[PDB]
Design a protein around this ligand. Structure first.
Ligand SMILES: CC(=O)N[C@H]1[C@@H](OP(=O)(O)OP(=O)(O)OC[C@H]2O[C@@H](n3ccc(=O)[nH]c3=O)[C@H](O)[C@@H]2O)O[C@H](CO)[C@@H](O)[C@@H]1O
Ligand SMILES: *[C@H](C)[C@H](O)P(=O)(O)O
Ligand SMILES: [Cl-]
Ligand SMILES: [K+]
Ligand SMILES: [K+]
Ligand SMILES: [K+]
Ligand SMILES: [K+]
Ligand SMILES: [K+]
Ligand code: NA
Length: 420
């Protein structure tokens, strides 16, 4: 139905406002299932397709969910007896749908949830979620396609995560808050959305210690209640605009940006010649006349985030030399580079390593997003391409960006969203 059309060759200048984080609001919506009494009010909720999908997941569990889009506010009433089967129709259309399992085990000792969807960028198993629930006393059944977890009593345990999985950390945390005694989770995700989640849980009456460190300690409680919470700013949307500014000889203030949440990105953009200044109003990015090449290796926190990789390849592909990216987190997150070949990108891919020769002019082309960050990366490449770039499959973009074309237009970019 729709495409984003870009004409390249404009400098970006001005101030951009950033929405609440996609990847904080979704597990916090799941956490609202733990509030046995009261009404949860979430503020700074972004208008994203994943929020509408997650709200339908939760409503099917016998919960009232009201999204006031004008106020960026969601109210949740989970005070009734929860149903325990999440609806495949919605679960299959996003990733974070799976993290209703933890709260359903905490409230009811019973959860039925299918394998989730989301960005089609690798195998994306959930084995570590299921291992953690087993460690807390759940029996895990697969009937013919389905995943059922049953716990007559959740009991705290020590749980070592083989990989610091964001979703597994969230799912296990949300079961453990109502487990009997102490849970210790070793090698947890340290991403700042884990901290935002822990902070709302603690406000709701939980005892979650060590969020943002490698070891979490949870002391089970009998009851959680509803609170008011404001979602943390979206560090990935923030970072996307930092890259846009850095690649267009721009001067952009990212309003109220949290520099602590983008230390790797800021460091790498400085290596490429950006000037980045922490100001009273936000983080200012000044793009250089001569973009310098740099290498990127994705890693779990505290290394370079995989959710900035695609966007970063757009600036690497216009740098004055050869850059390398190594994608260590996901197995299939280079399809945007194949599309950028249509735009005259010179890139060699060998397993998890891509080598980019930026000494070529990108040319406008019709390109097809395959996933959320790939869509943003193709629009960014458009900002530097000679002529007209048409970015298609905006369903992927709408999972994580609100008004992306309007925010770019307001910085002086020639970007439109139109019907095909
Ligand atoms: C909705 C949401 O918050 N999405 C984010 C979340 O996804 P998500 O929570 O799916 O990401 P994980 O941290 O779990 O996955 C990272 C890697 O861990 C491994 N793994 C994970 C779980 C498991 O049970 N077994 C296993 O092996 C896989 O190698 C996977 O490739 O964190 C990712 C990593 O920063 C981000 O890219 C996503 O945007
Ligand atoms: C792309 C990786 C998205 O953030 P998810 O919601 O599928 O994880
Ligand atoms: Cl996607
Ligand atoms: K319980
Ligand atoms: K039960
Ligand atoms: K917050
Ligand atoms: K170049
Ligand atoms: K890879
Ligand atoms: Na969508």
């Amino acid at each position: 139905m729709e495409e984003i059309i870009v004409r390249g060759g404009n400098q970006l200048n001005g101030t951009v406002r950033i929405e609440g984080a996609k990847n904080a609001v979704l597990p916090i919506l799941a956490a609202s299932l733990l509030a046995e009494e009261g009404i949860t009010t979430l503020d700074n909720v972004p208008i994203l397709s994943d929020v509408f999908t997650m709200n339908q997941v939760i409503r099917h569990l016998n919960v009232d969910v009201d999204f006031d889009e004008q106020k960026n506010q969601v109210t949740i009433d989970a005070s009734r007896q929860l149903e325990i089967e999440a609806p495949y129709e919605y679960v299959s259309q996003m990733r974070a749908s799976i993290v209703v399992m933890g709260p359903l085990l905490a409230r009811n000792g019973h959860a039925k949830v299918a394998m989730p969807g989301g960005c089609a960028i690798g195998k994306r198993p959930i084995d570590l979620h299921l291992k953690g629930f087993q460690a807390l006393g759940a029996k895990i059944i697969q009937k013919n396609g389905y995943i059922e977890a049953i716990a007559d009593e959740l009991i705290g345990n020590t749980i070592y995560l083989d990989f610091p999985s964001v979703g597994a950390t969230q799912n296990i945390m949300m079961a453990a808050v109502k487990a009997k005694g102490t849970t210790i989770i070793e090698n947890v995700a340290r991403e700042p959305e884990i901290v935002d989640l822990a902070n709302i849980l603690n406000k709701m009456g939980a005892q979650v210690y060590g969020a943002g460190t490698e070891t979490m300690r949870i002391e089970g409680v009998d009851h959680l209640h509803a609170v008011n919470h404001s979602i943390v700013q979206d560090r990935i949307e923030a970072g996307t605009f930092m890259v846009a500014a850095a690649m267009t000889q721009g001067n952009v203030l990212i309003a109220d940006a949290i520099s602590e949440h983008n230390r790797p990105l800021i460091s790498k953009l400085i290596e490429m010649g950006a000037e980045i200044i922490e100001e009273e109003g936000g983080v200012r990015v000044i793009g250089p006349k001569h973009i310098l090449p740099t290498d990127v290796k994705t890693m779990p926190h505290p290394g370079f985030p995989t959710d900035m990789q695609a966007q970063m390849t757009a600036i690497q592909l216009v740098a004055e030399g050869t850059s390398v990216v190594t994608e260590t987190v996901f197995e299939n997150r280079f399809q945007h580079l194949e599309e950028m070949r249509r735009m005259n990108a010179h890139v060699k891919i060998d397993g998890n390593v891509a080598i980019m020769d930026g000494n070529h002019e990108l040319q406008g082309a019709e390109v097809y997003a395959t996933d959320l960050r790939a869509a943003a990366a193709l629009v960014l490449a458009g900002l530097k391409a000679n002529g007209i770039t048409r970015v298609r499959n905006l369903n992927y973009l709408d999972r994580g960006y609100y008004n992306f074309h309007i925010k770019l237009q307001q910085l002086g970019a020639d970007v439109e969203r139109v019907d095909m």
